[PDB]
DNA sequence: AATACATGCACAGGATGTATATATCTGACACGTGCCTGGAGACTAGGGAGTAATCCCCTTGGCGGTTAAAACGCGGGGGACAGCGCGTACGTGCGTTTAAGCGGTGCTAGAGCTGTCTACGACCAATTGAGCGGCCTCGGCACCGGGATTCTCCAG
DNA sequence: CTGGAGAATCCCGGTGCCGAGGCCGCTCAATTGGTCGTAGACAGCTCTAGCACCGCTTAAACGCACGTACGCGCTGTCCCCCGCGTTTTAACCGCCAAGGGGATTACTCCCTAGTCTCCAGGCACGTGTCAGATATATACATCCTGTGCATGTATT
């Protein structure tokens, strides 16, 4: 099996394959390949890198240390995806 | 010195107009702000909110609930045409997806 | 502390439209953020109209054309009708 | 005797209908939170979070991937096919107007 | 008043006299109609006290049930063994497991009211509140009454809204931090005399006056030096260890905050985010808890694993020193990863361990405690988490206890301290507890000492 | 005897020639009559400054060129060379101009 | 003087030039009428959004700046014409 | 004359000075000058709107150098942003040191 | 007293080439905030100067590669599209008379290419 | 008078809408500020109507090509058919690890004081930037010639 | 099959050859730089307490792995038909010139309308509290798959 001090599963791979499957059936697709998951993790890392870079820039400008919900609403609004709900 | 009539009570509105005027002045849009401006703007906001909430109330009536949840108004906006076109790049949190399965994926055999 | 919001007015028009219908907490936050976004978009458009026509003020004409711009067809028509009716009510009274 | 296995393409349909008729999240919250903290660690080190911030951009990333899988399924249907593939999301991200 | 001896309803029953005096106290509380707090020291027959109370109740007061007993899940089979060994006439049941055996258990025995006493762990009550709110409970006895430390926990609510007649409490260390623990316990047991915490503060020589204002109506507090007189009191030596070279360079490395290698860049990887004091606790315990402190590993357990933290250095020097001493040793690791590292090390030094991590199932738990407590036992080392292991067990076989790291609360340190000092010991109760310097751990034991001092001024009476 | 070209190479000649050029591929006067024809029913009797008509020709030409580029991407991904109305309908559906 | 059927004045080789700039080799039939519909609805959108600007400015003449602003608010900004 | 046709202020001479700085032997057509002028007006509008929304969000009223710094950190991507921030900070510290 | 000393403009006082005063005036009249800091239009004009310098460098390179001496809109289009970050900054911007980057798809190349 | 494939029920099974209790927690509402909005007036300046100058868009006319329109034929691409095989769906058994509930810190959001130097505003000077005009060099255009890719026989 | 020879148009490139928009030089103006006087946004310094991090506990549902099998993706063939390529025939775009009036647009006076500023008061918010909408549980009828096979026509 495995030996002790079990620290594993690099953090992008923590987004598990049935979660991408559940997102797929939520998106309404009948049948997935076996290669969709890796590039999907790449797409998600790219998108979160852009949005988190904007929110970190916002919170750096306000001289804070805690990313709020308002910072990521401003970051997503500045990208073209206005998120209702959280904050405001 | 007389009784204070709110301008929303003189416009027949339900939205406030003193807050809208204070927002227009402090929001740095122009150095001057007309007196028909906050009345007209609160009228448009009141019509838009009535327009959403009527359809969201119908959708909450379909799912046998009194309350209106984000799923109801999300289905109401994406089910309507014009409100969808107004809110195309707008992601309602806790909203879910309108049900749509493409017809070549049903078995039908 | 003090933080203004459009909660009670949304509740008022909700009770006006449907007299027996509640609303959540998060649906109230969604409607409040929606009203904030729409008002911000219309006010920014009227500001850009006032800059384009070399003006410096915002009267009802600039926001009426901003409503003409921002909304699709029948929604824009009915919002213009509602706004003109309300400003005639305000001026005549 | 003779156990009842469902045909390929039936549990898929019921899964699509069940997950489209719901509105909850799909990604589990603690791996997403640790992923967000590792992305945000790259830009600046000492970053706290709101604990509603991660829920906010979880809803954002979920809506993004749902739209991406939707038009990916669209173009895969267009290719006289049902299974989506890497070229599907590459074409969708290209003509979508992204990188 | 009542039974002036070790009574007759208990079978194989040797009640000591001070426990019988406490029994007279509880029955006088029952006559006065007041919920009380039985909160003396551990190892004073407290489970035998309440078992003797219900053995008096069913026999001479004709109370056949129900009287639930709330325990941590590490004490269910112990309590059921004490019920089956001392007062057998009470119908004895116990509930544990997933929803399937829970449904089977309620469908069998919990519908007709056939039992008399039902021991039940905490989370089982949180899951079966809908079942147990459909009963008329005579008593309510909570063993280890410190899950009710705050009065805002969902367990605290769900035990406050029991439609029941009597409440009784059973803990060892009834004070937790300043006043609000006693406040919440008083607002649980007798809620109709208690309104706000400012009332408790205004009632609080004023400290000893409020102490007797608790002690006379509803409190009982003793120590084994008052009643036992046949045992060593304690035997403690506070030994401080050195800091290894790897320990010191890891300490400077974590104090400059600019350390990691596990990518193309020298990032931080979130490990120095907010709570740097517990990161220094993790450092001072062992650097190998962090990533890559061992080299790019073929996972062998060298002596460099034990010579890279001074606690482990003194520990490896002392385990043959206790082997020639020839008695059972008792290690209490707070961090479970440190317990795993000690598991690897005692496998490397080839002694017999029984790991009590806190995620082990109960069926592999009670038999482990029994095999440690067998007559002429063999399992030399006994590795436990401090909380889920040292909360409520009895370990009178050993005599030396190794408190590896004292946490922020000194009273759970006293609980894991006196686990070995339960009924007393044939030998003396040696304590070899470790402490590292040049860190926050001295501040930990100092704040624990101030908490223990403000507990001591009121716990002397 | 009348030496011909193979079907498929004059199109490549035209592709290199028009991508090298930067002119207006649609002539200007029927485009101007089109713009007046569809502005005839918004407000009657307008005037165009003809830099407006130049700007409209540039905007619609750049828009249609980007549309045909993405449509060509679509009909290549669908294992074809020719483009067909399902490709441009997919291009506007994925890009979001069509709902 | 209202004009009639100028959309079919966008001739087939003009659409072929517009396509062969985009980089397409073979072009099937009946892509043409779809291209007419696309072009017509796009510049209907931008002509409505320009006429509204002109009628707000109280003019009778659509300037190039109204077209530039109407393309700007559509997220399709056009440079060059004196922005 | 003809009422001295109004001062249509634009960015012609500054574009032309910079063009003589980088490529000192290269002219520019007038339509390209209109392109660069519309470009610099658009980019100034983008940075101004971004710094305005930043100063609005922090509930302040003073657009100073820090908000333009974070506005060009938001707008410009990557290496362009870092080089522009370095150049702007150098210009501001020169103007403050020599005022 | 020196009621008008040597009028050293701020573009020469920042070591710049862009109209600091005109940018200050357009920030004041531009309805952007209540007050506008003094260190702001220097930073803004410097950033605009650097961006224009980058675009003109690439346009001059692409025009010299076409042997001409005047930057035309085609050279501006090829300069902005043959660079990644400028393409992402101008991912929506069409320019007039610009043309397209030359790019035939690899599939549409003729078969038996050899 | 038994085989071959097809159509269709039967029924075995599994999910699922629904009937009904009920536990709860969370939205609806009641109250007590107080701070923002309104009443009320002075004002000045931004907009509003007038007015002539004038550029500048719209019609008309001609004509001369250049592009569109129509036609053919065929060759190669789209599309249906079919063969296969392996790649993905589905069911089940272990296992792990998220999730809700604990304690248990303390960093850091956030509110309030408060003093100044920051920008606003105004005056006055003076000069740089827009406009106008002239002029000529870069570039578009055109002939024309020489290379450069393509297509087909045809002798390998 | 098949490279290649050679026509054979296509296209680059060269060399004039006009020509007309950059390009620079006055010009003179609205704008900006210098001075300086106020005032109040923000920098900076408090406290403070809210919530964010962080590990343990204990359940239990999903994730992982594997088995199996079959259904869809891929390739390959045929065919057929329909867009490409070229030729011939129209047609109407574009270039040029000229007129005409009309919107426009910069200047002028004037005048109401939003701003500024006190003074008071009542609607919006924060806090608390409680009952009912719904989340949950369990039970049961109600549909949907699936497929085994009985047979409903065909085959023999
Ligand atoms: N009469 C008696 N004879 C022998 N042993 C006794 C007697 N009474 C109590 N004990 C021992 O003292 C121990 C006290 O344990 P206790 O502290 O009551 O457990 P807890 O900490 O759960 O309350 C019991 O486990 C029992 O073994």
Author numbering:
A (entry chain B): 15 to 102
B (entry chain G): 11 to 119
C (entry chain H): 29 to 121
D (entry chain A): 36 to 134
E (entry chain W): 166 to 369, 378 to 634
F (entry chain E): 37 to 135
G (entry chain F): 20 to 102
H (entry chain D): 24 to 122
The authors write:
Here we present cryo-EM structures of the full-length form of the human ISWI remodeler, SNF2h bound to a nucleosome. Carrying out cryo-EM without any cross-linking and using the ATP analog ADP-BeFx enabled us to trap three different conformational states of the SNF2h-nucleosome complex: a state with an unexpectedly translocated nucleosome, a state with two SNF2h protomers bound to a nucleosome and a state with one protomer bound to a nucleosome that shows increased disorder within the histone core. Like most ISWI remodelers, SNF2h slides mono-nucleosomes assembled on short stretches of DNA towards the center of the DNA. In addition to the ATPase domain, SNF2h has a C-terminal domain termed HAND-SANT-SLIDE (HSS), which binds flanking DNA, and an N-terminal region termed AutoN, which plays an autoihibitory role.
